Design a protein around this ligand. Structure first.
Ligand SMILES: [Cu+2]
Ligand SMILES: [Cu+2]
Ligand SMILES: [Cu+]
Lengths: 59, 55
């Protein structure tokens, strides 16, 4: 049910699900609370930020 | 002006430096951390003087 996963530099992951929803886990894979309005760097060199329960990606 | 986002509320975002313009053409600061909808049916938000676009 995961359509996409952002692999973040600090070891955490954000899963985007088929249902529209979004989940985050730390480097150990335990669930995290998702920050809002906080820029997060991916391992493939992009930046994302979460807001209003949506993901925005650097332009 | 290198890039222009046309917004729903009638205003514009320019990247030249970055700034906004109301419907009347009056320039204004670029609102940080605030989501905005483009006439082309996408959403943007700016942070630390960078534009992020709905993924
Ligand atoms: Cu997982
Ligand atoms: Cu202009
Ligand atoms: Cu999130």
């Amino acid at each position: 049910n995961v359509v996409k996963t952002y692999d973040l530099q600090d070891g955490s992951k954000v899963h985007v699900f088929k249902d529209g929803k979004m989940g985050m886990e730390n480097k150990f894979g335990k669930s995290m609370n998702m920050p809002e309005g906080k820029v997060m760097e991916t391992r493939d060199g992009t930046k994302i930020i979460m807001k209003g329960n949506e993901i925005f990606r650097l332009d």
